[PDB]
Amino acid sequence: SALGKLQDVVNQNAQALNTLVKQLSSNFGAISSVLNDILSRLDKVEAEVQIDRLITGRLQSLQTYVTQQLIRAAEIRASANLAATKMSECVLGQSKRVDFCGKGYHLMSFPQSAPHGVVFLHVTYVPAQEKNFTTAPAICHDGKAHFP
Amino acid sequence: TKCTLKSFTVEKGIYQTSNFRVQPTESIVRFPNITNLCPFGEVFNATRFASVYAWNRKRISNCVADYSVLYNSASFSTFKCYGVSPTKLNDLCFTNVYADSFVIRGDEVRQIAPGQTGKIADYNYKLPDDFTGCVIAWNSNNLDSKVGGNYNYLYRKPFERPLQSYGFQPTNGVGYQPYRVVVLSFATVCGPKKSTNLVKNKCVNFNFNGLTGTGVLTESNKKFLPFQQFGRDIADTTDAVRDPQTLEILDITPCSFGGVSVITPGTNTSNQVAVLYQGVNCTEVNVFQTRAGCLIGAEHVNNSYECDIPIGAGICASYQTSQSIIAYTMSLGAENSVAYSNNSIAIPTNFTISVTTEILPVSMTKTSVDCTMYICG
Amino acid sequence: YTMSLGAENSVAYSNNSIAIPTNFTISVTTEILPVSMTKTSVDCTMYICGDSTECSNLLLQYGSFCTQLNRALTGIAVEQDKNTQEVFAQVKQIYKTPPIKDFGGFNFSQILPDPSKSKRSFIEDLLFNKVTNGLTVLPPLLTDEMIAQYTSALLAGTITSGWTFGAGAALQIPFAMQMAYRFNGIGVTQNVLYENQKLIANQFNSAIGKIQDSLSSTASALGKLQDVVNQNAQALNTLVKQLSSNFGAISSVLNDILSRLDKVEAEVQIDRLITGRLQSLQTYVTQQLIRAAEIRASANLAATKMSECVLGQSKRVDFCGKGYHLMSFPQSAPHGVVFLHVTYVPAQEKNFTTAPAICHDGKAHFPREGVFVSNGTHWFVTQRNFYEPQIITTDNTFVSGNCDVVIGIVNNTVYDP
Amino acid sequence: AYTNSFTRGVYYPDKVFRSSVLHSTQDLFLPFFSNVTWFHNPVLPFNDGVYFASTEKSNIIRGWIFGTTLDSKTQSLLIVNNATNVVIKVCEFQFCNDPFLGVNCTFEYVSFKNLREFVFKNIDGYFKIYSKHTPINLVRDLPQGFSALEPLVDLPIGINITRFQTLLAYYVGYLQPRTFLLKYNENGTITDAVDCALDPLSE
């Protein structure tokens, strides 16, 4: 359940391809979705009317698939630009950007490969076991005020 | 859910398996109070008509055709059709109705029917066998001729004036006995506007003046101008009507509908499920009204927990302990009054090096589709 | 007219002149970000076919289209809850403010919760007042009252504990001392705060007052959020108006086609309405996918602002409004978030003669922090962002090498304490 | 002679209530600020249908005639207010040049101080009448202001009309196919309109 992002990226592409394949079985108003039924049963002047329905439907199904893959590729590119920015600032450096490199004060991170993705092991200092203290902004000495 | 997902195993979640839609309980029809009925008494109740040697025309428009009453009444001895039957003709219409009529001996009247044979059908009182309607007749021996016979009359193009002197007589056989007859064919001359009572507050199918829909009709305070019949929403949609039999205004609300959403733990964990009827009010459908919709088959709980399966409007559900699905307002986290004051600071005396995994997708499966082979194989 | 890009300014540059600000203004600048569309779902059989059985049977011939549309819109809808939760749910615990309000003279009363109101702040109520066929709108997961508990927790953490509630459990610190950290985080020596604490508190309180006046004077400030509400309404109205269109069919009222014609002709005319309505719905869903990608980019920006700019002190120039960033306060708004970025803007500069280094006994001295300046007669060292002239000493300065190498070095005493 | 129509000659385009909303519609309307011909009478063209109006304090204007010839050849409308009723018929009428006050057939129907305004049009065989009445404070021209005309009559009679004339201070202007934006108020009356083709601000 940790790798839900990468396994969802696999599932979205598998569902998109399987939707695109299953749409080959749709009639779109033709006498059959098996293109060889039309070509064996109908003579050209009738067959071209029914094949125009399958072409129009299948072409609209590809335009739907490619449109959704262009938008999904823009989402994955935004994540790849984020991962590239993480590797630059967070592996190759020490980022001061709060919660950019895991929840804590960031120390370092280690990249590990994963299918269709990347994994960062963000090593962070998290403070613990606090004590309450009385505090002051400044301290008087010989009438002069001292600050840390 | 298994069918919706095309799978025998279902993971934990909420799935929109169906769309619920309140069914129309009955059909309503409304049209104005009946008026301007066609004056057929001049054919059916009159004592005489034009000679079979010289038939006469008739017509009507801007009127209601009582053809169902004309077919049902005993005032005609018989009828027959070149067009559709009188059960269809009782709801037919034309821009005007057109007709012709005559009186003769009953067999001479038959000799002028649509598709008949004789001097009447030939020219004196003609009508085609393909005429766009029906013909009807009745006996007339009490008025169409005297006891000395109809000797003052005449006997035998379409619907108009092959001819000679008449010879019908009331003491004669059924072909020579006096009779009267007519025929007609086919917006302003329509059959009657059959109408129901009105039903409010139920979901109903409806017709008003020939617009139609399905909805909950409700009494309303929209002030339509005297000529206005229908009311519209901002985006074209009909949202009120005037009742044509009593001129009050009815506001129309859609019959309640929404996504049936099945809340489930994984099928590994249980076969028990709860159903959210999204946006629906439970009166329209354990039971719990959420702000997201009516929720059925989950226990409402007064505790709060982290959100397991999200329902909406602050509600979440989970499968919990002796076990059932529960629904609760999600906990945003434990409360904490920070011990602030103008001179107190808390300083950590120790640390934990924490290693937190973060996972990012970076690439899709690189597809290419040969669209000529996909489309045309 | 030909537009002007701005007023001309020949900067008073010369190889030995520096301008150091002698005073500042705390500025509070509103920033407004969209975070979520209106969650929507369409019963595409009810949209396309209006509960007609004759049409519904024809729509089955189109296969997965009136199912992958619902899946696409469901993806957008779940993503709006994710967008909202990535922004606000960055806090582990619902922190809350003490009954006392001893914040060193700073006055958060206009941005903290009003328990007489949901329990939104005063400014959150201004922000919530200024924004104004098988289609369904689904509620957000977090209610506006839950969003206000998160902005309250983020704000109460930010006030009582500084950045520490992002890095771990919240650690209390006095608010005057938190602002003294925020001043060190912009390179201003912290005594500049404590010595000016009343003035800085008044500038903050007054600047928060100007937010209320600005938000009361015009609705045009919330243009980004009102544009998102308008685009959702425009898209849904366009989708409904497209039910009235013929697409070459003999009528757009489906019950006309089914009563005007015999079944063979009716199926052809209905298939034009199915094709046009389905193309209209695909057009709507495609625009909503592209608009949801635009709102996700804004929600990821708002989530990044809340992490770096509220839970921390971003050192990224102009990420957190103009001026050097001190802190920011989140306030909720319809379909979005508002940040009140508090920033130090320097305001009353003096010109001074300057030098990169100073010769003493042939040793070249450089400032440890700050820069050398002269009032005309005497030489001082000063922090870069606030004019505070200090005597030049072996504590304020470090030696390196000798006088000969440095271009533009000058001669002065360095006092050895 | 001619006068400026101002913002007059708008009518309720359809039998529908709409409230607090702006509706954009294309129909045969009198264009804003058009030249309305003025009369103190001759036979006139009908064209795409007619706006007609008369300033009154006397009730001397009474009726209209419409058709192709308006005489003998074919069915022709006669309309007359006789103070007992509005009287309508469509016969193949024949008369002198026009009947005036001394102060076959197929269908029939029966039902300065002021301005009476009217619109007459013929679409899909329906001859339609709209009208309005108002007090006024100007004699020589139509008063600048707004008041939508509302339907009276809607005859399914199917007659061809290309000419009309008036039976009896009156004004005539021609409708044209134009887009208007109509301001329906909270009570569903039209209270203002934009003739979209008038000027770039109206577009």
Ligand SMILES: *[C@@H]1O[C@H](CO)[C@@H](O[C@@H]2O[C@H](CO)[C@@H](O)[C@H](O)[C@H]2NC(C)=O)[C@H](O)[C@H]1NC(C)=O
């Ligand atoms: C720094 O600038 C502030 C204004 O931002 C100055 O404060 C104002 O001082 C005048 C009198 O000189 C008062 O009339 C105003 O009411 C003050 N405003 C505020 C907000 O307090 C301040 O005096 C300047 N300080 C220095 C050292 O120059």
Ligand SMILES: *[C@@H]1O[C@H](CO)[C@@H](O[C@@H]2O[C@H](CO)[C@@H](O)[C@H](O)[C@H]2NC(C)=O)[C@H](O)[C@H]1NC(C)=O
């Ligand atoms: C914090 O600031 C608010 C205003 O921003 C102060 O409340 C106002 O006080 C004045 C004078 O008493 C009244 O005229 C207003 O009606 C008050 N407004 C509201 C909304 O209450 C508040 O007193 C200040 N608190 C502190 C501790 O300085």
Ligand SMILES: *[C@@H]1O[C@H](CO)[C@@H](O[C@@H]2O[C@H](CO)[C@@H](O)[C@H](O)[C@H]2NC(C)=O)[C@H](O)[C@H]1NC(C)=O
């Ligand atoms: C530059 O700064 C020095 C030190 O602040 C100024 O010298 C002092 O001037 C005051 C009178 O203005 C005298 O009372 C002090 O005794 C002076 N101190 C020293 C060490 O000489 C100097 O006047 C300033 N010059 C300018 C041009 O502002």
Ligand SMILES: *[C@@H]1O[C@H](CO)[C@@H](O[C@@H]2O[C@H](CO)[C@@H](O)[C@H](O)[C@H]2NC(C)=O)[C@H](O)[C@H]1NC(C)=O
């Ligand atoms: C800084 O002070 C030194 C002396 O401490 C100056 O050096 C003298 O420069 C002149 C001209 O080149 C020579 O005649 C002397 O012999 C130099 N003395 C020494 C000890 O080197 C130097 O010129 C001053 N520099 C500036 C920029 O004022």
Ligand SMILES: *[C@@H]1O[C@H](CO)[C@@H](O)[C@H](O)[C@H]1NC(C)=O
């Ligand atoms: C600090 O002191 C307060 C009482 O003054 C107490 O409620 C709080 O729990 C203490 N916190 C820690 C971390 O000891």
Ligand SMILES: *[C@@H]1O[C@H](CO)[C@@H](O)[C@H](O)[C@H]1NC(C)=O
């Ligand atoms: C004809 O007369 C009878 C008299 O009983 C009456 O009932 C019937 O309604 C009349 N029919 C017509 C068409 O006038």
Ligand SMILES: *[C@@H]1O[C@H](CO)[C@@H](O)[C@H](O)[C@H]1NC(C)=O
């Ligand atoms: C219809 O007739 C009934 C009486 O039968 C009457 O009460 C009602 O007002 C009439 N409605 C109209 C619109 O004339």
Ligand SMILES: *[C@@H]1O[C@H](CO)[C@@H](O)[C@H](O)[C@H]1NC(C)=O
């Ligand atoms: C569910 O069952 C599958 C095998 O059918 C198993 O691999 C998986 O670990 C199980 N998960 C849980 C949560 O029980």
Ligand SMILES: *[C@@H]1O[C@H](CO)[C@@H](O)[C@H](O)[C@H]1NC(C)=O
């Ligand atoms: C609709 O739901 C509300 C609560 O959301 C309830 O008070 C009301 O009774 C329901 N409507 C009906 C007609 O029962």
Ligand SMILES: *[C@@H]1O[C@H](CO)[C@@H](O)[C@H](O)[C@H]1NC(C)=O
């Ligand atoms: C839950 O809370 C309601 C009031 O909000 C109360 O009536 C009910 O008895 C409570 N039930 C339990 C099990 O606490």
Ligand SMILES: *[C@@H]1O[C@H](CO)[C@@H](O)[C@H](O)[C@H]1NC(C)=O
């Ligand atoms: C700090 O915490 C660790 C466990 O994280 C513990 O073993 C160690 O003894 C602690 N040290 C001090 C000084 O408290």
Ligand SMILES: *[C@@H]1O[C@H](CO)[C@@H](O)[C@H](O)[C@H]1NC(C)=O
């Ligand atoms: C600095 O001095 C120059 C003239 O030497 C002048 O033009 C410029 O305006 C001055 N700037 C300030 C901030 O006083």
Ligand SMILES: *[C@@H]1O[C@H](CO)[C@@H](O)[C@H](O)[C@H]1NC(C)=O
């Ligand atoms: C500064 O400006 C002028 C012109 O460049 C030059 O005469 C002078 O020597 C320069 N001084 C330094 C320290 O570069």
Ligand SMILES: *[C@@H]1O[C@H](CO)[C@@H](O)[C@H](O)[C@H]1NC(C)=O
């Ligand atoms: C028609 O109207 C325009 C202004 O709209 C005017 O210029 C023109 O002179 C008018 N025509 C006549 C014949 O008066």
Ligand SMILES: *[C@@H]1O[C@H](CO)[C@@H](O)[C@H](O)[C@H]1NC(C)=O
């Ligand atoms: C008006 O016309 C009707 C016939 O349509 C007639 O009976 C009536 O007498 C006329 N009244 C007047 C005042 O001319």
Ligand SMILES: *[C@@H]1O[C@H](CO)[C@@H](O)[C@H](O)[C@H]1NC(C)=O
């Ligand atoms: C009446 O109609 C007949 C044809 O039916 C035609 O010959 C005659 O000229 C018409 N007369 C008038 C006045 O319309």
